[PDB]
Amino acid sequence: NHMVTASAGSLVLPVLVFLWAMLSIPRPSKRFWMTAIVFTEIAVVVKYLFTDGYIKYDLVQLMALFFHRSQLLCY
Amino acid sequence: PLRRFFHDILHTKYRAATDVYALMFLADVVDFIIIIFGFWPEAFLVMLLIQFSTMVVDRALYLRKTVLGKLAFQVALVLAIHLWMFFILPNVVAQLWYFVKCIYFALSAYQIRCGYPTRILGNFLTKKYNHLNLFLFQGFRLVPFLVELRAVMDWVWTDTTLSLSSWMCVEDIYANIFIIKCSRETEKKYPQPKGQKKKKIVKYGMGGLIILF
Amino acid sequence: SWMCVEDIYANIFIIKCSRETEKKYPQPKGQKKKKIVKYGMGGLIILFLIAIIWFPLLFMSLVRSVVGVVNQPIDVTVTLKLGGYEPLFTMSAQQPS
Amino acid sequence: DHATVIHSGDYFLFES
Amino acid sequence: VDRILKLCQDIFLVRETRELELEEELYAKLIFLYRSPETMIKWTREKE
Amino acid sequence: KVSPPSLGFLAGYGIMGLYVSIVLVIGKFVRGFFSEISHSIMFEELPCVDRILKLCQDIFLVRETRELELEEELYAKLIFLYRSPETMIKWTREKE
Ligand SMILES: CCCCCCCC/C=C/CCCCCCCC(=O)O[C@@H](COC(=O)CCCCCCCCCCCCCCCCC)COP(=O)(O)OCCN
Ligand SMILES: CCCCCCCC/C=C/CCCCCCCC(=O)O[C@@H](COC(=O)CCCCCCCCCCCCCCCCC)COP(=O)(O)OCCN
């Protein structure tokens, strides 16, 4: 997403991947995944309330993060 | 909570140790190449120096085995690159540079989470004595400056009783004993009968090229 | 042969000097070389290598940071000519114009 | 002394 | 060239475990093999 | 805008190629110091270089007093020390 959109909103999550998720000992906790879900939802709403290619990659993102949740809840 | 988080990464108990320097470095080489080849200038100049300087610091933390130092280097670099390349500096070239630097940050984090092993000293290509190894070793020697910089860097950071003259004489004996060992192996796996002329093809190939040059 | 006697002597002198210094200032057995010595010698060498690769390029690129000059016309000469004939109109708009 | 250990090898080490 | 590869790899093991007194004594063996051309024809012979 | 450079001799892709070539040459020069330094260990790691200093200084005394027959016989000793690697490990040993 940050390679395509290249904004300043889509910078928060890549930083947090490299410094909170990948450095967490057992597994990235609930709070990481919930933060990512909440942030991506916000950005969708904010950009909606303001181009013709704004919320396509963010739909994929949100749906991928909710897939993970389902696996990390079945095991 | 911040204190607690950090403690964990630095002093846990679930640390199966691994060595991913070889590869962390290959990503850095590939990056270097992208910057240089796709130079299309002060920007390129400064960035080239940056990449070079990160590589030097990386070697230091490997040879001195510090996990706290690697944590700090990661934090700094992640923030810095994500700011410089997304605010200051501004493109397929820069889009790649980023993907390849993202792979570096991932592999680095694996090392800060897994811990350094016990035996970190010893070349990567001098472990197996085949034919691929010989050709890669010899190729690495041809790149101008690599062999020398490795030697001096390893001296400064490893604890030794010898000087630099003597360090570099131990490293030369080893390079040449390796190359002889590789050739001795190939001639045991593929022997040649006693009194058998070298085949014409080999001769005409090698000789031919030289004459043409 | 003269020059082979003179070379043996030069190198035997240099070894002799170093053997002396290491008798006047001995070093204990099994003592790591001090970090300062290492960082000094090594540091310089590393720096030289960077300055034999990057610095040349940098200086050439510094030369390239220059300017261009506004060469405004001194005279703007304009003619209107019908066919082969003498120009109907000629004017030279100089500096003030 | 360091330099009397570095410079003290003989032919007996390279024995059997 | 096998017996020399063992000396070169033992200098490296000692550097790892920081037993620096044996780094000096093993450097002395490597330097006195390369200073006597005829002890290299004994150390580097095919032991068959 | 017109353009008049002062140091415009450093221009062109020929100058880029020149730079590369310089690096290569300097690279080979530096390799010199780090490459075959194991080939001269026999003549540069001598333990006690005192007995050779006496031969070298006696060739010089003989040249002064013009007794040139002994310059030849002392040159023969110096040349047969450097022609037998194992008589240099006897002459250059620490006599303690
Ligand atoms: C078993 C081999 C089969 C796998 C194939 C992958 C190897 C790829 C081909 C290798 C030969 C090509 C050399 C590329 C770099 C070496 C990678 C490697 O072998 O990986 C090496 C890294 O080499 C180095 O240590 C070099 C570090 C010093 C250089 C730092 C300053 C950089 C100087 C300028 C760099 C700019 C660009 C660099 C190269 C430019 C173009 C080549 C592994 O550290 P090592 O043996 O201590 O390890 C210890 C135990 N693992
Ligand atoms: C000196 C001023 C004269 C002007 C000429 C300018 C050229 C100076 C050096 C440029 C490099 C020219 C290469 C010469 C070719 C011989 C290589 C050599 O070691 O030749 C050496 C010197 O000679 C020797 O050491 C004798 C050994 C001969 C070994 C023959 C083959 C060894 C490696 C060849 C590769 C074999 C297969 C590898 C497969 C993959 C390789 C990618 C010159 O290299 P270099 O090392 O100091 O390279 C590093 C910086 N350029």
Numbering used by the authors:
A (entry chain A): 1698 to 1747, 1779 to 1803
B (entry chain A): 1941 to 1980, 2001 to 2050, 2060 to 2182
C (entry chain B): 2135 to 2231
D (entry chain A): 1408 to 1423
E (entry chain A): 2474 to 2521
F (entry chain B): 2426 to 2521
From the paper:
The purified hPIEZO1 protein was subjected to the standard cryo-EM workflow, resulting in a cryo-EM density map at a total resolution of 3.3 Å from approximately 87K particles that allowed us to build a near-atomic model of hPIEZO1. The rest of the THUs, along with the pore module consisting of an anchor, an outer helix (OH), an IH, and a cap domain, are resolved. The hPIEZO1 density map, filtered with a low-pass filter, shows a disk approximately 30 nm wide with a horn-like density in the peripheral blade region, likely due to the PTMs such as glycosylation. Structural comparison of hPIEZO1 and curved mPIEZO1 shows that hPIEZO1 presents a more flattened structure from the side view. The blades of hPIEZO1 are about 5 Å down toward the cytoplasmic side than those of mPIEZO1. Therefore, hPIEZO1 appears more extended than the curved mPIEZO1. The pore radius of hPIEZO1 is between that of the curved and flattened mPIEZO1. Therefore, the curved hPIEZO1 may still represent a nonconducting state, and the differences in curvature and pore radius may be implicated in channel gating properties of hPIEZO1 and mPIEZO1. We also carefully checked the corresponding pore lipid configuration in the 3.3 Å resolution map of hPIEZO1 and the 3.8 Å resolution map of hPIEZO1-A1988V without the multi-lipidated MDFIC auxiliary subunit and found that in wild-type hPIEZO1, similar pore lipids also insert into the hydrophobic pore interacting with R2456. Our high-resolution structures support a model in which the pore lipids directly seal the central hydrophobic pore and involve fast inactivation of hPIEZO1.
